[PDB]
Amino acid sequence: KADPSHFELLKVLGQGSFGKVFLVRKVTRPDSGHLYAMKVLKILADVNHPFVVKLHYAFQTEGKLYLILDFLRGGDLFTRLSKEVMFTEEDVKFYLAELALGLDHLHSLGIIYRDLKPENILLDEEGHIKLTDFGLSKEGTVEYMAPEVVNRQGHSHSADWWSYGVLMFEMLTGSLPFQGKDRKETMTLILKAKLGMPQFLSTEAQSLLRALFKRNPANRLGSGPDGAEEIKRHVFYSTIDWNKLYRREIKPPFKP
Ligand SMILES: CC(C)[C@H](CO)Nc1nc(Nc2cccc(Cl)c2)c2ncn(C(C)C)c2n1
């Protein structure tokens, strides 16, 4: 059975906001040689979906909870965003569509992806995305918080779609829609939900952002009754075949 001795440490990927994540190589059969990302801890984690990180092994060792997950070669969207400082609508439509599927699934499991942001969206070698650091059902980066969360008036699935809107805006413009000089001001800007629409954005993109940026979570796109479909049927994704996207048949615009 699983055991820390079955994995040799290759290198530390980075300090964590969830513990430390190491790049490990399994030493035991049958996946001997296979690379994995190892997370050590001192609430669901098992989800099966093309756009959600897979948990391969989980074992407790005296206070330490080891999680062996997929190693995503491509790194995260935050890193790519910083280097390219903004993606074309083409790239954005693609990442958001796959994210749309991943997110909705997590919502069906009754999970709320509270920490949705580019840092938590990984890319595999093919360029497809994979959501990480999810799981919590019973609840951060302020720039991504929905107004009901800032005011602590609740935190349902709707909150995620607002954050989804923020991710879209940041990838499309290189900037955050609501940014103050400090956390306080940012939260106040989120509450006013006062938003200027950059003129280089397509009308379809602008339409979608306006629908996602509804202060009242009940009027926010994704708030049913067709839930995620409400967002998937938006004109912004007209050219997206969800069937093949799910099957990973759509060619990623970016290849790491
Ligand atoms: C430690 C952080 C700097 C990074 C990026 O957010 N985290 C990260 N990078 C990953 N991949 C990755 C690939 C190439 C270079 C670098 Cl620095 C990271 C990764 N693969 C699988 N997971 C989790 C499910 C644990 C991962 N998590």
Asked if 123 and 76 count as a contact pair (C-beta separation under 8 A), the reply is: yes
Catalytic choice (76, 91, 104, 115): 115
Using the atom order of ligand 1, give the atom closest to the CA of residue 69.
24
Q: Label each residue of the chain as H, E or C.
A: CCCHHHEEEEEEEECCCCCEEEEEEECCCCCCCCEEEEEEECCCCCCCCCCECCEEEEEEECCEEEEEECCCCCEEHHHHHHHHCCCCHHHHHHHHHHHHHHHHHHHHCCCCCCCCCHHHEEECCCCCEEECCCCCCCCCCHHHCCHHHHCCCCCCHHHHHHHHHHHHHHHHHCCCCCCCCCHHHHHHHHHHCCCCCCCCCCHHHHHHHHHHCCCCCCCCCCCCCCHHHHHHCCHHHCCCCHHHHHCCCCCCCCCC
Question: Which residue, of 16, 51, 75, is where some domain finishes?
Answer: 75
Q: Are residues 108 and 21 in the same domain?
A: no
Amino acid in position 129 = I
Distance 120 CA to ligand 1 centre (A): 9
Q: Are residues 65 and 181 in the same domain?
A: no
Distance 218 CA to ligand 1 centre (A): 35
Resolution of the structure in the document, Å: 2.1
Chain breaks in the chain (C to N over 2.5 A) after: 42, 139
- Is 76 an annotated catalytic residue? no
Distance 248 CA to ligand 1 centre (A): 21
What is the Cα–Cα distance from 110 to 106, expressed in whole angstroms? 6
Q: Are residues 120 and 222 in the same domain?
A: yes
**Which tokens hold the place of 151?**
């005011």
Domain that holds residue 195: 76-256
Q: Are residues 7 and 124 in the same domain?
A: no
Decide: 190 in ligand 1 pocket, CB within 6 A: no
- The closest of 97, 103, 52 to 240, measured between CA atoms, is 97
What is the Cα–Cα distance from 101 to 97, expressed in whole angstroms? 7
